């Protein structure tokens, strides 16, 4: 297989990789690396980046893709604004999650949260070829 | 090809199971097994959770994905809040989809009614090892 | 590789093509194709169908996924109500995206503006097998 490479910055110290539960998971639970002690609040119709404190080395021909937590929309209503998330192999930046409540409640955001799943994919680029003159894809 | 499984509950007895349209297709449209000659009224800004009667076998290595129908999200504003929703090859569970109404009327699910498409794709678990010091997936 | 054909409708005309920006990039971004001197505005929780000029001809055995851009989803609270958006090897009509405003200013659409990016991706049909009787995919 190939091999997802993880940086951990200095806020992911202490917290668990992101790992797959089982040989049948499809996805990885991602957390959230914010300041222990500290609760972040997401009121109703709000937005905001989530962070992870890792950086990830995706291998060319790969992608990760940032999708929600179903119990997390379920519940309360959250879900990740971006879905899927696009994490490229050029990226060397943090992850962060772009969290929305779309729910009523108040929501509460605390260190070591699972706030969204990665999944790990090959990616092609197909070649691009202009050409001259049902199906899903119309509205 | 792999084969997905499919045990149907009672209350999807009668409906037409999923399949794909095409030889072309990407997808499979999944429908509302709620129960007949019942509207269940989904107002702007909420959200719930509408079964299928279906239980996925989905085989080693694959996940399903679902994904919105594209039609109600623009005629209705309504969407899967949880999107793509990731269904892995351990779960056993009532397939449901989680509709949110980002529109401004009242939406009406009724039964048969085709409310999320499925896709099935290959799944992949890479390494994960930890690494020490553009692209897409930043803000 | 596969060729994803690209025909381009008048109101294309003058735009670049979609690209990928490096061997690394996982999609690439798609542009409005709106009248030119046209501001279209989206208001707060309103959605609309923005033509991108392009017919797609993707061929049999792919897909292409119509996902957010991470930007305009963080700044503005814009993204692709119906995301990722299915777009099949059957469909021949012009590729359109559906954005809705989750933020809370008025956004102005202007032509050439990136709008959603594309990842083009191979599909497959199980065998739909009907059978008698934790995992990701529950709430």
Redesign the interface.
């Known amino acids: 297989?190939?091999?997802?490479?993880?940086?951990?910055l200095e806020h992911a110290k202490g917290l668990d990789?992101?790992?797959?539960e089982?040989?049948?998971?499809?996805?990885?639970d991602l957390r959230a690396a914010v300041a222990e002690d500290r609760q972040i609040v997401l009121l109703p119709?709000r937005?905001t980046?989530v962070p992870t404190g890792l950086?990830?080395?995706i291998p060319?021909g790969?992608?990760?893709?940032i999708?929600?937590?179903?119990?997390l929309?379920?519940?309360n209503?959250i879900?990740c604004?971006?879905?899927?998330?696009?994490?490229?192999?050029?990226?060397?930046?943090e992850?962060?999650v772009?969290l929305?409540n779309?729910?009523?409640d108040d929501f509460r955001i605390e260190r070591g949260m699972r706030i969204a799943?990665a999944?790990?994919?090959?990616?092609?680029?197909?070649?691009?070829?202009?050409?001259?003159?049902?199906?899903?894809?119309?509205?």
Chains 1, 2, 3 share one sequence.
């Open positions: 297989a190939p091999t997802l490479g993880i940086i951990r990789l992101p790992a797959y089982t040989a049948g998971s499809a996805g990885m119709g937005r980046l950086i990830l080395e060319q790969y992608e990760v893709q999708r929600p937590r179903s119990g929309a379920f519940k209503g879900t604004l971006n879905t899927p998330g696009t994490i490229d192999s050029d990226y060397r930046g992850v962060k772009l929305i779309l729910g009523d799943q999944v790990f994919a090959p990616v092609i680029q197909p070649k691009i070829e202009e050409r001259a003159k049902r199906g899903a894809g119309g509205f």
